[PDB]
């Protein structure tokens, strides 16, 4: 049901609060960063690849 | 709770049905999915079959019942005990 959910999420929502954010890379609904529009999994995956500008391992 | 400025709330379709039935000698059951509707003094005198998640339960309206959401008068889930 992932594809149908993805398509419906893309479509405009009937009411404002209905609109919800998915990971545009995989469609995962939960833990979707607004800054990157990616889930945590996809974000961490791409960040390791180095294809998310600016991001890097945090340490202090 | 609900802001006073916004005024009372009720679904438009439900409101239209009650208004059309206002001049009715014998009120007929109003089948509604709308739990959100607030009850109104005009609503008094009617029986409303409110959806409970699996069927429309009829509930009779009266002056005491006014001022509350319809869905409250129709319990969703059933629990008998252990």
């Amino acid at each position: 049901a992932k594809k149908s959910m993805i398509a419906k999420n893309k479509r405009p929502a009937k009411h404002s609060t209905q609109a919800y954010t998915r990971c545009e890379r995989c469609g995962r609904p939960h833990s979707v960063y607004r800054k990157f529009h990616l889930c945590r999994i996809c974000f961490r995956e791409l960040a390791y690849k180095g294809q998310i500008p600016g991001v890097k391992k945090a340490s202090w | 709770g609900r802001s006073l400025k916004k005024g009372p709330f009720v679904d438009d379709h439900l409101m239209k049905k009650v208004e059309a039935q206002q001049g009715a000698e014998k009120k007929k059951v109003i089948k509604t999915w709308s739990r959100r509707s607030t009850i109104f003094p005009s609503f008094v005198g009617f029986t409303i079959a409110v959806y409970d998640g699996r069927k429309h339960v009829p509930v009779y309206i009266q002056e005491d019942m006014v001022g509350h959401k319809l869905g409250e008068f129709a319990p969703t889930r059933t629990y008998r005990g252990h």
């Binding site: 545009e24 890379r25 607004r34 800054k35 990157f36 529009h37 990616l38 791409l46 960040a47 390791y48 690849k49 180095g50 294809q51 998310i52 500008p53 600016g54 890097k56 391992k57 | -």
Partner: protein
């Protein structure tokens, strides 16, 4: 135990962002644009030995440096092939796409290229041991200070999956100064997916 991604570990120490551009309000749109561009380029030039894609952004322009071991193949005759790619990318993105090509000297020392080659062979039903060994020899001849490779899955279609790996030289993943290239590729077989990992250590930085 698990290990940090070899590239992601050194990103910012000696490795740099492949998406080389800066933005604040269009970060999301530009990142999604980059992802779609990468996907389309990978699908289009799968045959070509395309390893690295670097994106730079200046106003509405987008510069794309594509590294390949077959620059002739990617360009085509008289710039024909790259021009067609540019037009398709313009349609996809909606903005000017400047394209640059780079010749990958020593493809044997590239993680993704070596891994993809092993994946092709596994799809072709070569002995995985032979594939990894000859890949290692090519890398060592190319001059890697070290190489390491691993293939995991239902080897030979076996019911119980396992992992077989080889290495030569030195591949100190923990040493941060060390320039250790890494890449992961999946070789899809009749029995499912087989995962190939390659670590290549060149002269440290």
């Amino acid at each position: 135990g698990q290990k940090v991604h070899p590239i992601g570990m050194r990103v910012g120490i000696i490795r740099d962002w492949d998406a080389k551009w800066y933005a604040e309000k269009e970060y999301a749109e530009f990142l999604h644009e980059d992802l779609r561009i990468r996907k389309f380029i990978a699908t289009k030039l799968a045959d070509a030995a395309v390893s690295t894609i670097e994106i730079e952004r200046a106003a509405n322009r987008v510069n794309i440096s594509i590294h390949t071991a077959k620059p002739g193949m990617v360009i085509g005759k008289g710039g024909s092939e790259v021009e067609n790619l540019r037009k398709e990318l313009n349609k996809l993105t909606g903005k000017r796409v400047h394209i640059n090509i780079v010749e990958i000297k020593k493809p044997d020392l590239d993680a993704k290229l070596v891994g993809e080659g092993i994946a092709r062979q596994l799809e072709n039903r070569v002995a995985f041991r032979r594939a990894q060994k000859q890949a290692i020899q090519r890398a060592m001849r190319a001059g890697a200070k070290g190489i390491k490779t691993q293939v995991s899955g239902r080897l030979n279609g076996a019911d119980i999956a396992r992992s077989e790996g080889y290495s030569e030289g030195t591949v100190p993943l923990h040493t941060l100064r060390a320039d250790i290239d890494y890449a992961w590729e999946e070789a899809d077989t009749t029995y499912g997916k087989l995962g190939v990992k390659v670590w290549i250590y060149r002269g440290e930085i």
